[PDB]
């Protein structure tokens, strides 16, 4: 029952966060393209401050495809042994229609539920 | 009376390209956003083969605000003693929401009036 986030919405690719617990985190990505063609070769990409150690496991594809036909999901488990508020910085990348595209993001709106 | 060319749409972002000729062709760039949000601190770069050369010249401003209501304009004039077919490849980068967003295309599209 912790609260999901959106992690990420900006011209079409938006990335919710949800969040499990059983001093780890356990986030599941989801990614959904709300434009008019598909996200190929996506890579996300994710790093904590050195306080907290992240593991990255395998996404579902690297596809997200045009108007919200589908998602990429892709597990994250963050190790948070000093119990501080979690913090993230994202990087997103892809090709659409022949251009390449980048982006980066902090994401700071987890909710306390993810980490206290 | 060279034909202008799109040099650049994606997401929102539009780049065009008009050019005059009094081997040196004069490129002045016309960059649009059709987004909700401006796009600052932008910067356009620009590369070619060795084989011409480019010299870009300062911006209009660092700013394409929102909602189409200006552009940023800025020169490039390049130099192409062989008089190959001119191309480029351009990368562009901005803040948009606070996200650092950056773009890559090849311009291969030129008008043989831009060259010829």
Same mark, same amino acid.
């Given at each position: 029952?912790?609260?999901?986030?959106?992690?990420?919405?900006?011209?079409?690719?938006?990335?919710?966060?949800?969040?499990?617990?059983?001093?780890?985190?356990?986030?599941?990505?989801?990614? #959904?393209?709300?434009?008019?063609?598909?996200? =190929?070769?996506?890579?996300? %990409?994710?790093?904590?401050?050195?306080?907290? &150690?992240? /593991?990255?496991?395998?996404?579902? #594809?690297?596809?997200?495809?045009?108007?919200? =036909?589908?998602?990429?999901? %892709?597990?994250?488990?963050?190790?948070?042994? &000093?119990? /501080?508020?979690?913090?993230?910085?994202?990087?997103?990348?892809?090709?659409?229609?022949?251009?390449?595209?980048?982006?980066?993001?902090?994401?700071?709106?987890?909710?306390? /539920?993810?980490?206290?």
């Amino acid at each position: 029952m912790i609260p999901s986030i959106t992690a990420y919405d900006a011209l079409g690719l938006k990335i919710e966060f949800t969040f499990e617990r059983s001093s780890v985190t356990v986030i599941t990505i989801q990614a #959904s393209n709300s434009t008019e063609l598909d996200m =190929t070769d996506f890579v996300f %990409q994710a790093a904590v401050p050195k306080t907290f &150690q992240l /593991q990255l496991l395998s996404p579902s #594809s690297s596809v997200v495809p045009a108007f919200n =036909t589908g998602t990429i999901t %892709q597990v994250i488990k963050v190790l948070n042994p &000093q119990k /501080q508020q979690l913090r993230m910085r994202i990087k997103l990348t892809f090709n659409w229609n022949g251009y390449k595209v980048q982006s980066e993001a902090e994401v700071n709106n987890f909710p306390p /539920q993810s980490w206290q």
